[PDB]
Amino acid sequence: ARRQNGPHIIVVPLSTMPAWLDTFEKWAPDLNCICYMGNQKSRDTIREYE
DNA sequence: GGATGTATATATCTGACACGTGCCTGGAGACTAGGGAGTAATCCCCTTGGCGGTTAAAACGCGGGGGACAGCGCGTACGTG
């Protein structure tokens, strides 16, 4: 609505984070929501590929 | 009849003790000041019991091969007179 489609950050506990991921998959499927967890190489993969 | 082993008595060594003496250093008495005990406040560090998540280090198993150890020879360096 307000065209503020810039970078947003949501900081959640790790145990509830699948319960946020499926909520983003269900309610806002057109959004480019990404997940940031894992070891050094997975975060590097997210950093330089996405 | 001559020579030999043992037994009590007296002089000498030898560390310890009684007495003497100096003197100086420790003790008795009085006074004082300050060092340390006690109190209160404030703030930071440590204790004991929990939780969550990362992850690198610790634990375990197994092959193998390098090294510890035992045995044997030798010759020389050290023991002995």
UniProtKB/Swiss-Prot annotation:
Disruption phenotype: Decreased sensitivity to the cytotoxic effects of 6-azauracil.
Residue intervals passing through the bilayer: none
Record-annotated disulphide pairs: none
Family the entry assigns: Belongs to the SNF2/RAD54 helicase family.
Domain topic, free-text comment: The 2 chromodomains are involved in the binding to the histone H3 methyllysine at position 4 (H3K4me3). The CHD1 helical C-terminal domain (CHCT) binds DNA and nucleosomes.
Subunit structure: Component of the 1.8 MDa SAGA complex, which consists of at least of TRA1, CHD1, SPT7, TAF5, ADA3, SGF73, SPT20/ADA5, SPT8, TAF12, TAF6, HFI1/ADA1, UBP8, GCN5, ADA2, SPT3, SGF29, TAF10, TAF9, SGF11 and SUS1. TAF5, TAF6, TAF9, TAF19, TAF12 and ADA1 seem to be present in 2 copies. SAGA is built of 5 distinct domains with specialized functions. Domain I (containing TRA1) probably represents the activator interaction surface.
Protein name, per record: Chromo domain-containing protein 1
Organism of provenance: Saccharomyces cerevisiae (strain ATCC 204508 / S288c)
Covered residues, full protein: 421 to 470 of 1468
